[PDB]
Structure formats: C-alpha cells, structure tokens
Design an enzyme around this catalytic site. Structure first.
Site, PDB file in Angstrom:
ATOM      1  CD  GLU A 159      -5.321  -4.519  -5.055  1.00 13.08           C
ATOM      2  OE1 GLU A 159      -5.194  -4.340  -3.914  1.00 13.08           O
ATOM      3  OE2 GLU A 159      -4.017  -5.031  -4.951  1.00 13.08           O
ATOM      4  CB  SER A 210      -0.545   0.315   1.344  1.00 13.02           C
ATOM      5  OG  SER A 210      -1.704   1.523   0.672  1.00 13.02           O
ATOM      6  CG  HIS A 261      -5.313  -2.969  -0.822  1.00 16.75           C
ATOM      7  ND1 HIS A 261      -3.969  -2.459  -1.566  1.00 16.75           N
ATOM      8  CD2 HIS A 261      -4.829  -2.099   0.161  1.00 16.75           C
ATOM      9  CE1 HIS A 261      -3.540  -1.800  -1.100  1.00 16.75           C
ATOM     10  NE2 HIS A 261      -3.743  -1.701   0.420  1.00 16.75           N
TER      11      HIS A 261
END
Length: 566
Positions: A347, A214, A467
């Site tokens: 994601e 990230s 994610h």
C-alpha cells in the site's frame, strides 16, 4: 507533474475523445425514473461487448448559490425526456496532471450501466464510490469505465458527490446550518435514488452492493455506519480503507476562517461573517487555496486534508456523523451485512513521489513519534510515553541501524491502512449479529496495463503493488488497451470482476466458476481468530495467513495501557 506527462496526458485526452465517439452507437433507449424519463445510449467496448449507458442523471438539486455548503435537496421532476447520453462535469477540484482547477459546482450526478436493459431476472446492483481523498475524483468513463463489469450480468452505478471545502466545510454556529459532511449527505441521497429506481434498469433493489476504494472505501464504510441509510443496501466492499483510518475524518471547524482569510476575507473570526464571505467567493478560488489551509503543526501530526468527514457539532435532520466513527461502529446497522475488506501487498509504495520531494520525512522513523496515533500522542510528541509508543513502531518497520525509504513506505501501509483495518474488525466483532467478513490481499503486479494514479504517485517503472494498482483490473480508463484473452492481465480482470459480482450476488465471494479458485477454501474471519486469513491474489489465488499480522499486533501493543482507546 512533469511537462512530459502533461503532454502525454493531453494526447491521451484527445485520443479518448475520438475513441468515445467511435464507440458510441445510434441505439438510444428510454427508461423510467421516479423523476421522469431518461434517454440513454448503447456503447461499445474494446473487447467487442456492448452496454446501455445512462450518464448525467441528477439525484440532487444543483448545490449552487444559497445551497452551497448545505445538505443536498431532492431534484425537481420533469415531464419529457432528459438527455443522458453525455457525462456531466466533475466536482470542482484541482487536476493532478495539469494543476489547474477544473469541474463545476453542478456535479451531483450518477451513471447507470448494464449489458441488458430487459433482463429475464432482476440483477445485482453494484454502486461504486470513487476515492481521491475526498478532494478529487469523478464518475467519468475515462477514469471509471464499466467495460469490464458489463461482461457480467449486473447493473453498475458510479456516483459523484461534492469534494473538498464545497463538500466538507463545517461551522459550529447552529444558526447557519452548515454542520458539515455535505459530501457524505450527497452519497446518502444518491443511495436513496438507487434504492427507488434501480428496478427500472433491471436491477434488484433487494440485492445492492456498495463498494469503494481509498476515500471511496471510507465513504462506503460511512454509508454502513449512518442511521440515514439503514436497510438501503445489502453488501459492502471496503477496498484499502475505512472510516477509522486517520485520514478519513478530521475536526475542521476552525479551518473555515483560515480558508476565508486566504481568499481575501477582511474581518473577525465569527462563523456568520466567514460563511457570508465564503458563500460569495468564486468556487475555483476556494479549491485552489485548500492546499494552504493546514498549518505546519497539522501536517506534522499527519493531518492529510483540511476538509473532510467530521463529527457534526449539532444534530440536523440530515445528519450523517453524530459521534466519532469508532463510536458509531458500536451501533452500526452495517455491522450485520456481508462485508469484504482488503488491501494491496505494498500500500505505502504509493508515497514514493512525496518521499522524493521530502527526503527529510525518512528521518521521522528515528523515533517514529509522529506516526503514533494522535489520540495517544502528546502535543509536541515529546512525552516519555510517546517516545515509548514510537519505539514499538520503530521496532516493527525499521530493519537496520538507519531507517530506509522502504521502511517508511512499509510503515505507511500500516499507519494508513492495515492498523485501522485491524481496529475495525476487532471493534466490529464486539457488536455484530455474526454476518461474515472476508479478507483479500491484492498482490498482482503488472506494468503492461495501468491507470492514471500511477502518473500521480510517480509509479513509472516501480515494482510492487501500490494503493490503487487494483482499480486497473476493475474499470476501463483512457490509459488502458485491449489485452489478449490469454494474458495474465486479462485473466485478473475476469477474476476480480468475477469475485466482486459473485460476492454482490450471494454475499459469498467464492466460486469454482472462477479460474484458479479450484483449491480455494475461503473462510470468513472469526472473533476467536488470533491470525487473519485472507485470499491472496497474485498470478495464483492462494489462501494465506495475513503476512502483515506480526506488525499489526505490534501496533496494537501501543494500546496496552489504553485498551479502552482501541
């Protein structure tokens, strides 16, 4: 976050404290660093392995008082033994479970883990930079435990850096020496410490891998772009992110004023008077108020955070980002080290939580103009050109008459991750020696083992690979448990830590010593490739064409009449 998850977390926090005590041993050890001697301790894992743990090693001066908002300074040397048997506090931030501010301005530490302090050969050095949108996160073992990695013969290091306004305030006035990116400059100094000391822990300074996820992926990429770190490390892994993601930089020079005003500043908009107020304010009041800084226009245009990485307005000696990240790729030393990048299979499934509080956001896909890249869209998002680019996005993700929540989360996969990945590769191809870049797609879904971000994204009982779902198979966390050695979860832990350590050592991620890679031929991407090939990681490991390619190209088509902006 719900009362039940709050109490559940409180209890796991209590459990983790007692587990950490039980898993400690009496075997302390002392290592040399260039700053003086540090005492570490050996610890246990739930898989009955063990590792030497050095926590709370300072790599910078405590950034308090007059050093607040400023570039980090080298720490003061000491002559004696420094106690590194306990973790230091995290950067001041909002707790996502509790919603209360926690942490301290004294947070510039790193941790060093290894199963063997005196190896017979010097070992690959792995450096993890945590994500958390540049506003939350930590190197504490209850979130990032080295327990899995220490099965392999590596040295693993988890750093901290300043978050939020304290890490990324930026002022235009050159006299005030707050150009911005202090938090990135923290990352740099940590690297220089790692370069110069990893050998005392058995680490090979000529074989260093930096990786992150990230905001940690964007950070890793920034550490590959800046001249400040040239030659410092040798491999990079960009997990679900990079520096040209639209959330990964912002021009926040006006927002200091706004934040001061929120905090009680009486006076005019000039930098000097704003800085002086912000320098005396309580760190927690500042961080508490960051949420309110962005205007409605900014949120509308998808500006995600008030403070983060920025193009510094003047060049200083410690300057990290002197031009826009896209410009820096064109001169990036990092372009010529072995790189691995990848994303999860869903994601955007992360945004379910946010969608639930804001149903109206799904109507944005009616025209999709708010998702057109900012640099191409007009102010009000109402120009005929903008509705035209918006249309190309809508055709790519809206599946029926009316847009759905899944259309939305699918779009977000591309807006926040795949399209910036696509732009970086192509851009990188024009300016590189030709070192390989490998792609992976993490496509392994389990609810038997999880990590705390699932609490945040409201991911309880939700199918698909969001994610941050992959961190579970890399690090121990206080929600984890001992998994049977025959379980799909355990096997994936081996595969993931195996591939990463394989890549860290050789710069090539393939090994037939990894279960399931027997018929894998994992080739790097070529500039000639019209279609990206990636190793898709599910229950089986299978090389495929990147499934998101068609949509990726559709996004690209928005730059038809603006190829120089691509």
């Amino acid at each position: 976050v719900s009362l039940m998850e709050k109490l559940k977390w409180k209890i796991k926090c209590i459990e983790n404290k007692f587990l950490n005590y039980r898993l400690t041993t009496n075997e302390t050890v002392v290592a040399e660093t260039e700053y003086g001697k540090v005492k570490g301790v050996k610890r246990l894992t739930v898989y009955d392995d063990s590792y030497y743990s050095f926590e709370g090693i300072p790599y910078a001066q405590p950034p308090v008082g007059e050093l607040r908002f400023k570039a980090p300074q080298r720490p003061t040397p000491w002559d004696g033994v420094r106690d590194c048997c306990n973790h230091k506090d995290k950067s001041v931030q909002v707790d996502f479970i509790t919603g209360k501010v926690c942490g301290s301005e004294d947070c510039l530490y790193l941790s060093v883990y290894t199963n063997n302090l005196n190896p017979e050969t010097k070992r690959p050095v792995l450096v993890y930079i945590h994500g958390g949108g540049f506003i939350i996160g930590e190197n504490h073992r209850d979130m990032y435990g080295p327990d899995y990695f220490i099965k392999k013969d590596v040295v693993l290091i988890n750093i901290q850096y300043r978050l939020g306004a304290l890490g990324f305030l930026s002022l235009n006035s050159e006299d005030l020496n707050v150009p911005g990116n202090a938090g990135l400059k923290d990352q740099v100094m940590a690297l220089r410490w790692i370069k110069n000391n990893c050998a005392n822990f058995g680490g090979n300074p000529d074989n260093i891998t930096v990786f992150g996820e990230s905001a940690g992926a964007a950070s890793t990429h920034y550490m590959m772009l800046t001249e400040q770190t040239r030659g410092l490390f040798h491999r990079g892994i960009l997990m679900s992110g990079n520096a040209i993601c639209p959330w990964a930089n912002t021009q926040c020079q006006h927002r200091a004023f706004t934040l001061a005003k929120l905090a009680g500043y009486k006076g005019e908009d000039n930098d000097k008077d704003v800085l002086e107020f912000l320098m005396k304010a309580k760190p927690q009041d500042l961080i508490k108020l960051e949420e309110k800084v962005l205007t409605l226009e900014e949120r509308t245009n998808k500006v995600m955070f008030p403070f983060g990485p920025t193009v510094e307005p003047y060049q200083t000696a410690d300057c990290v980002l002197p031009k826009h990240p896209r410009e820096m790729v064109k001169t990036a030393w990092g372009n010529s080290i072995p790189t691995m990048m990848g994303n999860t299979s869903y994601e955007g499934l992360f945004f379910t939580s946010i969608l639930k509080q804001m149903p109206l956001l799904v109507k944005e896909l009616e025209t999709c103009v708010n998702f057109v890249p900012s640099e191409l869209a007009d102010a009000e998002r109402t120009a005929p050109e903008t509705l035209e680019m918006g249309a190309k996005i809508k055709k790519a993700h809206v599946t029926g008459e009316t847009p759905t929540a899944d259309n939305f989360m699918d779009l977000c996969s591309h807006f926040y991750f795949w399209f910036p990945m696509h732009r970086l590769l192509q851009l990188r191809f024009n300016h590189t020696s030709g070192t390989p870049v490998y792609l992976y797609r993490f496509d392994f879904d389990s609810e038997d083992l999880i990590n705390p971000y699932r609490i945040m994204r409201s991911g309880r009982g939700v199918k698909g690979v969001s994610h941050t779902d992959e961190l579970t198979y890399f690090f121990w966390n206080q929600l984890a448990k001992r998994m049977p050695k025959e379980s799909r979860e355990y096997k994936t832990i081996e595969r993931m830590t195996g591939i990463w350590t394989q890549f860290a050592t050789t710069g090539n991620p393939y090994s037939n010593e990894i279960e399931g890679m027997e018929n894998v031929s994992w080739d790097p991407i070529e500039k000639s490739d019209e279609v990206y090939k990636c190793l898709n990681i599910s229950d089986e490991l299978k090389m495929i064409d990147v499934p998101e390619m068609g949509k990726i190209k559709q996004w690209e088509s928005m730059f038809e009449k603006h190829r120089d902006l691509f």
